[PDB]
Design an enzyme around this catalytic site. Structure first.
Site, PDB file in Angstrom:
ATOM      1  CD  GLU A  13      -2.876  -1.352   2.246  1.00 22.47           C
ATOM      2  OE1 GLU A  13      -2.303  -1.280   3.357  1.00 22.47           O
ATOM      3  OE2 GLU A  13      -4.092  -1.720   2.112  1.00 22.47           O
ATOM      4  N   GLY A  79     -12.427  -4.598   1.260  1.00 23.67           N
ATOM      5  CA  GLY A  79     -13.519  -5.373   0.680  1.00 23.67           C
ATOM      6  C   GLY A  79     -14.701  -4.471   0.456  1.00 23.67           C
ATOM      7  CG  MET A 172      -8.668  -6.201   8.502  1.00 24.04           C
ATOM      8  SD  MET A 172      -7.564  -7.807   8.269  1.00 24.04           S
ATOM      9  CE  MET A 172      -7.312  -8.244  10.142  1.00 24.04           C
ATOM     10  CD  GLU A 173      -5.349  -2.271   8.286  1.00 22.16           C
ATOM     11  OE1 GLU A 173      -5.877  -1.867   7.244  1.00 22.16           O
ATOM     12  OE2 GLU A 173      -4.911  -3.431   8.428  1.00 22.16           O
ATOM     13  CG  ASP A 196     -11.854  -8.577  -0.942  1.00 24.49           C
ATOM     14  OD1 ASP A 196     -12.747  -8.652  -0.084  1.00 24.49           O
ATOM     15  OD2 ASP A 196     -10.727  -8.088  -0.704  1.00 24.49           O
TER      16      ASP A 196
HETATM   17  N1  LIG Z   1     -12.522  -8.813   2.855  1.00 25.25           N
HETATM   18  C1  LIG Z   1     -11.669  -8.066   3.570  1.00 25.25           C
HETATM   19  N2  LIG Z   1     -11.709  -8.069   4.919  1.00 25.25           N
HETATM   20  C2  LIG Z   1     -10.864  -7.280   5.648  1.00 25.25           C
HETATM   21  N3  LIG Z   1      -9.916  -6.466   5.136  1.00 25.25           N
HETATM   22  C3  LIG Z   1      -9.822  -6.415   3.796  1.00 25.25           C
HETATM   23  N4  LIG Z   1      -8.982  -5.780   2.987  1.00 25.25           N
HETATM   24  C4  LIG Z   1      -9.289  -6.115   1.707  1.00 25.25           C
HETATM   25  N5  LIG Z   1     -10.337  -6.975   1.677  1.00 25.25           N
HETATM   26  C5  LIG Z   1     -10.688  -7.212   2.947  1.00 25.25           C
END
Ligand SMILES: Nc1ncnc2[nH]cnc12
Ligand SMILES: Nc1ncnc2[nH]cnc12
Ligand code: NA
Ligand code: NA
Lengths: 228, 230
Positions: A13, A79, A172-173, A196
């Site tokens: 990143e 995501g 996650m951050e 995703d």
């Molecule tokens: N599905 C997901 N869950 C958590 N962090 C992500 N970062 C990218 N895709 C993610």
């Protein structure tokens, strides 16, 4: 705003950020590396935190307290929820921690006592980002980004987060970083490009699309720095 | 600097009230949307705060104590749910901490694992040994073991069973592993003390309501006995 933090969670990143800078100083601190450069007039402090809420909290705090940044721009991948799909990019209007649960004591999901479920990002930076996006002919989504210490890959969990929080992305951050900025009265910008859609295909889709998404975010964040 | 500076950190007001009561006199510093209480005690400068609950606020507060206030060591005092043999009223100091809610198993990592880090993060062996010696001197029962942390108040047998099976943890709480990891990253000696307010099952909310203040008082009493013997 003469000193700006550019923060990601993973090396992929921030690699595009460093590539654009070409030359920079490296500072070892807090068991991490912080990259410092004068970039056409502002001092940039760049780092990846390592994954998750604790590491991103630490790194954001160090950027603000130790390095004295005036603002923090988070760049990374996430995501997609609801209408967010691979190819899209979203800046948060606000963040939530989707994995916070003190419902045993009658608090809503996501709520820590003495705080709030949603924590706003900087309206001023967000509005500038929207202007720039329109100038560049790119679509910038905006909405609530949800954060937890899990990589989400199930329809069941996705549906919970959408129903509870009306979130448009999951990662996650963001919420940890944004909350640190809120508590320290530092303007924040949380940018995520979609890798995703957080379902059973998310791990493979992440492997396919994460670097593309990392580069998409990093490209836009540097356009924002060029004009901020 | 002539005096050691030690942070005393809880998560909730009730966890640090007894600490402040023992000082009587202290300065209040507003910073990072919180209050930090500063006093000299037994020739040591103490910096006392409650973080607010959970991993993010506890990470912020510990980092501020280290980076802004310059503490040399950090002692965490608070309450937890007991697992395995631990009962309401027991005290436990952590040998190591884990984040029980971390899950990147989608990419093959164990539960609790963040890449580039370790599942179990040790606390200060030196402070822990001192605490065990003091407990023995005082004829107090002090348990030791792994403490598990997550951003959920746990109140189900199913979740307890998972945490015990996966991590062999003896207590469960919402700040120890985050505080301990910050200390690890900044090379600061840590001590994580919890007293047991419930056993993290369906009765945990009621038990917490009955026993949290009792447990907070035990932990605060012991942490200050530790400070007395520095
Ligand atoms: N599905 C997901 N869950 C958590 N962090 C992500 N970062 C990218 N895709 C993610
Ligand atoms: N059961 C529990 N879960 C999380 N934190 C706690 N603190 C006290 N009891 C707890
Ligand atoms: Na340059
Ligand atoms: Na879309």
């Amino acid at each position: 705003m003469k000193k700006i933090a550019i923060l990601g969670a993973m090396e992929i990143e921030i690699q595009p950020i460093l590539q654009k800078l070409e030359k920079y100083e490296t500072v070892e601190y807090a068991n991490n590396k912080y990259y410092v450069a004068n970039y056409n007039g502002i001092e940039l402090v760049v780092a990846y935190s390592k994954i998750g809420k604790v590491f991103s909290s630490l790194t954001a705090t160090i950027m603000i307290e130790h390095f004295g940044v005036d603002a923090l721009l988070f760049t990374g991948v996430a995501g997609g929820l609801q209408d967010l799909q691979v190819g899209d990019m979203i800046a948060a209007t606000a963040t939530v921690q989707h994995d916070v649960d003190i419902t045993a004591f009658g608090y809503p999901y996501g709520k820590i006592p003495i705080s709030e479920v949603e924590i706003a990002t900087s309206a001023r930076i967000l509005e500038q980002a929207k202007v720039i996006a329109k100038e560049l002919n790119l679509n910038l989504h905006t909405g609530v980004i949800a954060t937890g210490d899990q990589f989400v890959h199930s329809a069941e969990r996705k549906d919970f987060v959408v129903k509870e929080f009306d979130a448009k992305a999951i990662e996650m951050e963001g919420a940890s970083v944004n909350l640190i900025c809120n508590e320290m009265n530092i303007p924040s910008f949380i940018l995520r490009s979609i890798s995703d859609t957080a379902d059973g295909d998310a791990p493979d889709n992440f492997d396919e699309f994460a670097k593309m998404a990392a580069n998409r975010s990093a490209d836009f964040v540097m356009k924002l720095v060029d004009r901020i």
